[PDB]
Design an enzyme around this catalytic site. Structure first.
Site, short mmCIF file in Angstrom:
data_model
loop_
_atom_site.label_atom_id
_atom_site.label_comp_id
_atom_site.label_asym_id
_atom_site.label_seq_id
_atom_site.Cartn_x
_atom_site.Cartn_y
_atom_site.Cartn_z
CG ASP A 67 -2.27 -0.84 0.74
OD1 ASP A 67 -2.29 -1.58 -0.23
OD2 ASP A 67 -3.23 -0.76 1.64
N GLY A 69 15.13 -2.15 7.27
CA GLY A 69 16.29 -2.72 6.58
C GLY A 69 17.34 -3.21 7.58
CD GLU A 98 8.67 1.38 10.56
OE1 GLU A 98 7.71 1.98 10.09
OE2 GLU A 98 9.86 1.32 10.00
#
Lengths: 256, 255, 253
Positions: free
Chosen positions: C138, C163, C186
């Site tokens: 999204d 990452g 997150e």
């Protein structure tokens, strides 16, 4: 129109068998025409009638069909390339046009064709999806998102990183609605057809979905799916019976 | 001060000024100030005697730029835009980039009138007008540096972090993130709050003027400012009858 | 390939875009093209276990060393970076063959693999990432460096997947098949979200986040057990004077 609606409706039932290849000229022309009306704000997915918000199911059907009759095309980015089937609302806009429509588009804000943006509106870098409707003098801040069929009233402030959830299916369900003069704080999210009533103030970090408990600290009542007008909402938590832990919730701290 | 006087004079009469009627001198003054801001020669707020001070006149210049400039069509490749604030890197060449010392990852964007220091890395993000981003700072994906915000050296702005701009009130200081601070993903720092040097803010911390910042150690409550070396996390404070709790930021340790 | 990379890595400090040797440049270029096409991947599941191939992380890090920054023409603006765009040379046929969608202005760096049936709404996919079949990404979401995203995963709007290049040892952030991550959530630092898990909105999972099992009273770290249903919550302090953020598993599917 009616024959317009009929056409959309019959074609919708056959959706699975429709391809950009095989589509009939009438269907095509029908869908294209409805998209243009959504884009110009002549038509709108949801509207307020006699104090209530109602959805036009057939309009939802037209948008869905548009995804079936159009093929993906290569879009030339500058440093990169894209591949999608929905055109950019401003690909052919000119200075005259922009002036007339009276809104501002800050790069790299992007809008899909099929979305309506009213005059006096400011779009900071953000995203506006197909079928959305953004009313006069609304400000959309950096990295915000106005999802599919979403209805944004007048004088709304959607702060940065704010997400307004899209609602296509189920067909029956009303889109996410933000009424006039509402203030939405940064990093907040309003999705799934929740309705935020007029003059409400939502602070930062508030997440509202159909399952979010909306605790009225005053009454001690819990609401779901809707934020009453003039409400002042902030994040909080509700303890477990044993109080060994607590769970997220939105709290109405004050009513204006 | 000629520059300053010119700015202040024009400001008083903002209402009657337009992109059409503005005079030669005013226009030049304003453009000149924007240029100084763009190159970091001038800055909206700065430290003096250990404290942050705001130069209102600089805010006035920014505001005036909005009034004397007109919206123009900007050709995107696939799309088009319409705005009155130019892009900072539109005329940059390799030479310049090389000289300036930072990196700009596509599609990161910066408005003219904002200073980006050397050794800085801008991942895809937005930097608005009047901001100052100091040396060796890292700006992650989908972060925002608002108007007039001040970011120190070696600062890390994680993904999706927002740094609130502050044009008006004129007197209000901008949001400041001091040197060597770490801001966790999805945090937001707005309204002139000052985050002192060496602070570590975790994920999902929202700090605005009315955010209670609770020092679990001493039980005090700070507002508008994060004391140097604080480690802040998201938390809640209970109601008097414990039937519920409200959002707050908690200082869990001071390094 | 692997040997060259490891060898070159040891001398990393003596290498620059100005003097990188022929063999070393060739190998790094080859390896990046392999990641880019899915032929290789940073982390993989072998016998029920995710394993991290450090040599690949090494290859990515070297790519950054041997390559110089270049001006990149934007239309209204300009950029300056050293990692190329994955789709810069794509043509209709390629896009067609590959079978995924890229919604403007979504952007992908070269060295990242995007599988068939995927839909990329406006978002960012960093180098070395692996995005499996039928995944939906999204608006304003981010797939960070070396991240592994399973099949039929739904990454909601504004979601960030952290990452992990360094440390070299550390496995990247992993999102298994059939997971649903709620808006503005997150997941970072190598946390592993096991298959079929559902994460609601505004959930922040880091290596230090306490993942509280309301049913068992157990607390997990760095891992979300398969089929978990997770929401945001708080754990009270001993006294009860304040509470601190945590993630809560409210049910297991």
């Amino acid at each position: 129109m009616q024959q317009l609606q009929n056409v959309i409706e019959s074609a919708f039932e056959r959706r699975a068998d429709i391809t950009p290849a095989n589509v009939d000229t009438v269907t095509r022309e029908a869908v294209n025409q409805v998209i243009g009306l959504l884009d110009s704000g002549a038509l709108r997915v949801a509207e307020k009638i006699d104090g209530q918000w109602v959805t036009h199911q057939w309009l939802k059907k037209a948008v869905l069909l548009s995804f079936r009759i159009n093929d993906n095309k290569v879009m030339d980015g500058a440093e990169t390339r894209y591949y999608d089937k929905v055109p950019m609302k401003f690909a052919d806009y000119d200075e005259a046009r922009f002036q007339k429509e009276g809104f501002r588009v800050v790069p790299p804000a992007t809008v899909r064709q099929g979305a309506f943006i009213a005059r006096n509106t400011v779009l900071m870098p953000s995203y506006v999806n197909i079928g959305a409707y953004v009313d006069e003098g609304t400000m959309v801040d950096t990295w915000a998102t106005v999802g599919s069929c979403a209805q944004i009233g007048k004088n709304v402030h959607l702060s940065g990183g704010v997400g307004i959830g899209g609602v296509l299916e189920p067909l029956q369900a009303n889109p996410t609605i933000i009424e006039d003069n509402c203030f939405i704080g940064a990093r907040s999210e309003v999705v799934e057809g929740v309705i935020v009533e007029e003059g409400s103030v939502i602070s930062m970090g508030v997440y509202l979905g159909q399952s979010t408990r909306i605790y009225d600290r005053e009454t001690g009542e819990i609401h779901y799916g809707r934020v009453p007008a003039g409400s002042v909402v902030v994040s909080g938590n509700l303890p477990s019976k044993d109080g060994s832990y607590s769970l997220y919730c939105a709290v109405i701290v004050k009513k204006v």
